[PDB]
Amino acid sequence: VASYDYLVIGGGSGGLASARRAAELGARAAVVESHKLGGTCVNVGCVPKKVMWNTAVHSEFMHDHADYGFPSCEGKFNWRVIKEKRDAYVSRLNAIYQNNLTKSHIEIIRGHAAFTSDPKPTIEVSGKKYTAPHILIATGGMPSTPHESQIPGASLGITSDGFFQLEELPGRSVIVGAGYIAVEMAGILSALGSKTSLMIRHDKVLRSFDSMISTNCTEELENAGVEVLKFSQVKEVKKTLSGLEVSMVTAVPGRLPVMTMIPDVDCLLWAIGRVPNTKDLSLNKLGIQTDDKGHIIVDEFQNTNVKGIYAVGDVCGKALLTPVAIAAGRKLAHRLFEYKEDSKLDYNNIPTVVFSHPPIGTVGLTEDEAIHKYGIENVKTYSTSFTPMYHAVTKRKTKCVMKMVCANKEEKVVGIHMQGLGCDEMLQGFAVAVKMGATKADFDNTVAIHPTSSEELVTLR
């Protein structure tokens, strides 16, 4: 029964971040990891995804080579080549990662962890038990797959975790979901050559994002050659001779339902949401609160319903982004160990980029979210649509949409949403302005950087 100042459950983005900051503050932390250190983030998340996104962008620009005065470019494309490099890059960083964690004198407890049936702050990792007045739950989540009970054959399809294990380009791809992980994957596969289909329960993807984004993204997916199967759900799946057959039902309002058999699918990817890893923590044994989906409940300070126990990251279910986990984990360390009874993460105005094609950028409230918080009368929105001049010479095209959500007489910028070339690297700066409480005037008093797309944001009329 060893004892530490800080005991972290889950050695990934949030856990490590928080633990490391603690030891930096003096605390003697001990993080527990059951698998690879770095969680979803490193291994099957962010980077490997960005690399794959880059490869896809490259592929697109190459459909432009000729347009740009060059002789046509082949396009065979070898997945195994990029995969190899991706794995290299990962472990390459992963090595540096480890080095740091190592020099942070943080003990790494190996094995699955769960809270036992004791009252004093303790969890049991493979027999042995550990205690600490402060215990953090940063076990993250996982890709959600349907039960054979619900959809027979469901285990035939993979998830984003499988996506990064793929060694070849699926000839025929089917992705089920409407979130960013789904949109992102369909984007890459399609760009890289797979005959891709995206199956969504409704008529547009990213429905939680602003209406303009949802509508525009769906249209771009289509223009890019991604078959968007609207108002469709997978009723059953099974292995055929040439791969997989997917039976889906399409229920378009104003139309009668219809069954369709999708044949020769080289692989199905489930991208229907993430599930928090809490089912084996045996939380109840301490009364740690959770919602019905399993997320650990917390207050503005990442405090669980039980003293001396906290939670940050995907496990909490709000804002599933590695930076949010990082920030939350650190602020906590500062509160618990630097004694800053105010150290806490502001979840408002967290900027997000969805790596679609072109990328999506967003921060602040959606128009609809604004209307509810301020009132229809107190909300004006500006927006523009245009074709990046990069496509001025291209047969192939993609537009750019921008929307600015303003509130009150002062027209405070409470929301910024956009999709288009560059937007992935264009948002960070504006997010900063938005968190300072920028106004439409603040944007308009800023001289435009011509010629770029970014300048359109400070010239919205």
Place this chain on the structure above:
Amino acid sequence: VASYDYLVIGGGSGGLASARRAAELGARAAVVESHKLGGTCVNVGCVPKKVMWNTAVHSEFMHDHADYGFPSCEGKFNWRVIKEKRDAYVSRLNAIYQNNLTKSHIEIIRGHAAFTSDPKPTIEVSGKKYTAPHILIATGGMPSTPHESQIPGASLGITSDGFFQLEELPGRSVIVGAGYIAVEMAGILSALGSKTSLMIRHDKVLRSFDSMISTNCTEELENAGVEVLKFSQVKEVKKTLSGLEVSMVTAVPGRLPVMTMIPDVDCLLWAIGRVPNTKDLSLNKLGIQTDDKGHIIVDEFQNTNVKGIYAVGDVCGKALLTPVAIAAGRKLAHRLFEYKEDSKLDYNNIPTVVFSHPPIGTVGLTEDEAIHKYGIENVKTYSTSFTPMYHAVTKRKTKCVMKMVCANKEEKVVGIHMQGLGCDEMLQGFAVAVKMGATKADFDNTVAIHPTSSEELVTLR
């Protein structure tokens, strides 16, 4: 002797902008243009330059095709193809441009204009004379070429104006200058295949920019295969059998001068600065003030040393950017016609992007400029250098540098300078923040957008 409310001299970026805003305010404007409406901006500036920049970027990314899992791409590249399209795009916009100017009921006086020898507000355009209580000088500037007196054979070399008239890719290129127009041109030519040399009077380019940028840009030019001829000047030029021979003198401190003959140059481009078009306005005939280089002097309100006469744009010599001309021209219209005795352009924190490879972004003071304004003790700077993960799988590389200049206890962000992938579209947002008076804290309280380069700006330690 017709009379108008607003008479504009020069129908380009600033003139048109200002005039158009005036008529929008009621004023009956009449702009005078001696050549093509749109000035340097449209015809031989911004867009045609960006197009050419894009083509070059494309060319670079194509040196990566194989790295990114694709079979090698040829690379012949046909300049005439892009040129044709560029010309198309230009006139295509140029058409829209005209449409607007037309529906703005602004009379366009054709012909060269200059102030006569009268006291009442009047200029003479091809015989006829025109008057107005408010007259704007927006004649812009022009590329500077040396005299045969100074450098014999100088007329053999072209300027940026010639660059956009080129129908082929010069096999061997030599560009003289250290400014952005010089750096930009060398970048494109080199990227597109020309064996390029950049001749600079000193050891680095963009010496007016921050030290980090100057140093980094020069190194990138070199890595990209651009021969940077340091401490060299063109002493003489002449046409040989295989093109042109350039005689230059290299004067490296700590070393003895040396003459070098550069042979087989397919074309020399002078990019040594811009000259304001005022020498034929016969300004003196009214006592309109100018500096020794010819720029028209003005106050914070674009007022010349003579009532009823103003000037905005390159002709004034400060901040030679189409947006600055636009902004200045409009604010003036608002002052003179909306009667806003405060309507004036803030020249502080004007953001600028230099389209090098990778692009350069900047706003605010340079570290050295900060030290002088606040004092060494009151200035701390943050900076980071790294390789965009886009190059994680590329043999070819380019780094990314970022520098944040802070002043006082509060660490107010007074300067932001960077070079790297995306920076061209990454700056606008941060400029906005910077003009609001952002602090290092304002940046740091903003959640990072991972994984991007932009996030490095809000995580500088």
